[PDB]
């Protein structure tokens, strides 16, 4: 086993020069530095470790160091360098697994005073080194001070443009901190058996003896890193044209709304308080004020007038002339109340609730103002689509790379339940095909938008989704209570269509949101809102579904007996005594339970997430063992993973058909692997884009 870390001239996306590297070898207990001209030797040392069947430890190596070295090795040395997945270890993956609870377990590190605020709940090397106690100082800070000494101005990340001995030293510090993190993580007896010195074992023993969760997490992080590098073929032109149409409709809605709602004056700027002029008593009914501290009618030493607008001591209310803005919720509330609307529901900060629920229900008198409410609802949705697709900071059009693909980021274990998180941009929040402009948005993401490098023909897409995931996880956990009755009934047709009809709901999506709202403890009023009724129908629906499968109550009761031992409420919060604050995941990991009322969701959402993690891992593994190669220069390419669904690009329709069958086989394999008490299934769709594959 060796511990290493690299430094380069830029992020993976634009890296072109290797600056330095450091390797710590446990067999020699020594550190070795590699400068730019030692790049080849550095690569050799890493391959030497692989040749011995050893392990290489990096912090975020799966996503950065490993691929960066492959890219730079080909660009600078013209060599194919590919460290095998089974020989790589990532302290970031391990840290996100063992310590997923860093937004709460970091409070006393900061309350006491030991971690710099900016690194709060951060898994980064600097953050972790601060917690460990190895921090000697940031490299960026030393570079910044050398530049403030030479008078030169600092630019974002210019500290990495060229190599220097300060970078080399900080690189060595990176490896010492990575070593410290590795040893602190291995000291967790829940994940790594104390009997084995995981720093003195081969890769095969490291994976077989450590908890299954460590292996699943490293395999998931390696596969999702490949998925990120692949990207999602995006139709830039289609979204640019949709942006033009939406902007035109926005301009028209704004024109009609500003015609109906004229401008007005309102206070903006005051930070002082207006107070009674004789008594001096504050009068917080009035808007905030500004009292000048300088000014008069004349200047100082036939005396020349003072033409500034203010007089020292004379208070005045700063105001703005404001044109109606449909994107504001203040303008909407003000104008609608000036039209007769009487707000019912408010926010705990003193502001009436202006969302689609109330807007859809607002009733005024003026027919024109009532129609303007519909123009506002359309404008707000139009704005949501424009912001997500083109104008927002993380807008799709701002993230399209030169390869015509969107390389969205994925944190394999960002959620406490074991689910992943998606950002830059969030490919898991694209508007659904059944929502306004959702089909155009989803159609913009598709394999057809990628033309084969050899034949030049567009690729085909294969979308696979887990059938009723969390409900099947519920059937599994409550099978000991109902003897597998629900696990058998669940496969009698589609569960969601059966629930839709049983509950008398308009759509199958409404049945999904209802069953999951109910299962996870929604109140009567909430179930009514979900179904578009009141608390009466909420109770009816709750007792109808809870009476049909009473084992749900037993499961909830058993969860409480396992996690909670007593409780008491003070103020707005629950004071819980925990027998154990976690759930054992399907792979043995500890799954932090945030609150007793979400414990069932923690149990079910974690199981599905772990099921899905092994599914995507097994699917690709099965494809690879079938001769299929992963990449755009191969046979298939993972394009997106949205919780329980995958979108894979396939060079041909035949390959897509194989991907769909393999995903079904991998799901059945996962079910057999963890001895599930409920049969797991998937549903596949072949098509040109995401709009057709779901």
């Amino acid at each position: 086993m060796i511990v290493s870390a690299i430094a380069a001239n830029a992020l993976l996306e634009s890296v072109t020069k290797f600056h330095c590297g450091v390797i710590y070898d446990y067999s020699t207990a020594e550190y070795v530095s590699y400068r730019p001209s030692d790049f080849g030797a550095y690569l050799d040392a890493l391959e030497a470790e692989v040749a011995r069947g050893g392990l290489i430890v990096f912090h975020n190596g799966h996503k950065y160091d490993v691929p960066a070295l492959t890219k730079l090795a080909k660009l600078q040395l013209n060599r194919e360098f590919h460290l095998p997945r089974e020989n790589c270890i990532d302290t970031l993956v391990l840290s996100r697994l063992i310590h997923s609870n860093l937004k709460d377990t970091d409070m006393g590190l900061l309350r006491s005073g030991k971690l710099p605020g900016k690194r709060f709940g951060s898994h980064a090397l600097e953050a972790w080194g601060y917690r460990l106690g190895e921090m000697k100082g940031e490299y960026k800070d030393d570079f910044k001070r050398m530049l403030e000494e030479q008078g030169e101005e600092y630019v974002d990340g210019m500290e990495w443009w060229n190599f220097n001995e300060e970078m080399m030293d900080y690189n060595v510090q990176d490896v010492v901190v990575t070593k410290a993190l590795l040893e602190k993580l291995l000291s967790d007896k829940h994940y790594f058996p104390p009997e084995i010195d995981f720093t003195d074992v081969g890769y095969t023993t490291f994976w077989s003896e450590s908890l299954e969760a460590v292996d699943i997490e490293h395999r998931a992080a390696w596969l999702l890193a490949k998925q990120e590098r692949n990207g999602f073929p995006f139709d830039t032109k289609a979204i640019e044209e949709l942006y033009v149409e939406l902007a035109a409709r926005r301009s028209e809605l704004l024109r009609k709304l500003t015609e109906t709602f004229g401008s007005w004056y309102q206070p903006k700027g005051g930070t002082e308080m207006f107070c009674h002029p004789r008594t001096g008593k504050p009068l917080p009914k009035y808007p905030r004020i500004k009292t000048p501290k300088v000014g008069g009618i004349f200047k100082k030493p036939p005396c020349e007038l003072d033409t500034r607008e203010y007089v020292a001591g004379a208070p005045y209310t700063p105001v703005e002339h404001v044109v109606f803005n449909p994107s504001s919720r203040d303008h909407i509330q003000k104008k609608l109340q000036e039209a007769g609307w009487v707000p019912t529901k408010y926010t705990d900060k003193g502001a009436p609730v202006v969302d689609d629920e109330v807007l859809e229900g607002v009733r005024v008198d003026d027919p024109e103002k009532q129609a303007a409410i519909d123009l506002i609802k359309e404008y707000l949705m139009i704005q949501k689509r424009i912001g997500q697709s083109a104008e927002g900071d993380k807008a799709w059009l701002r993230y399209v790379a030169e390869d015509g693909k969107i390389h969205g980021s994925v944190n394999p274990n960002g959620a406490v339940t074991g689910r992943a998180t998606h950002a830059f941009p969030n490919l898991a929040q694209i508007p659904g095909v059944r929502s306004p402009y959702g089909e155009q948005c989803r159609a913009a993401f598709g394999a057809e938008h990628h033309l084969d490098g050899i034949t030049g023909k567009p690729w085909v897409q294969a979308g696979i989704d887990a059938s009723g995931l969390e409900l099947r996880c519920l059937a599994h956990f409550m099978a000991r209570f109902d003897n597998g009755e629900y696990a058998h009934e669940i496969l009698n047709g589609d569960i969601h269509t059966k629930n839709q009809i049983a509950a008398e709901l308009p759509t199958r999506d409404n049945a999904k949101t209802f069953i999951y709202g109910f299962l996870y403890g929604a109140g009567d009023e909430k179930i009514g809102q979900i179904v578009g009724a009141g608390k009466e129908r909420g109770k009816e629906l709750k007792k109808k579904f809870l009476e049909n499968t009473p084992a749900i109550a037993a499961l909830r009761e058993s969860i409480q007996q396992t996690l909670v031992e007593s409780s008491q409420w003070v103020a707005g919060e629950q004071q819980v005594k925990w027998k154990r604050r976690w759930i054992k995941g399907l792979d043995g990991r500890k799954v932090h339970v945030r609150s007793p009322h979400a414990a069932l969701n923690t149990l079910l959402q974690s199981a599905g997430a772990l099921i899905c993690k092994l599914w995507i891992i097994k699917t690709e593994e099965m494809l690879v063992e079938k001769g299929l190669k992963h990449g755009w220069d191969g046979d298939f390419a993972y394009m997106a993973w949205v919780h329980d669904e995958i979108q894979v690009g396939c060079r041909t329709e035949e390959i897509a058909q194989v991907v769909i069958e393999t995903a079904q086989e991998a799901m059945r394999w996962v079910g057999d692997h963890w001895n599930f008490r409920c049969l797991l299934d998937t549903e596949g769709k072949m098509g040109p884009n995401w709009a057709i594959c779901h």
Binding site: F477, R480, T562, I583, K584, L603
Partner: peptide
């Protein structure tokens, strides 16, 4: 019995 316990599962989780």
């Amino acid at each position: 019995d316990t599962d989780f």
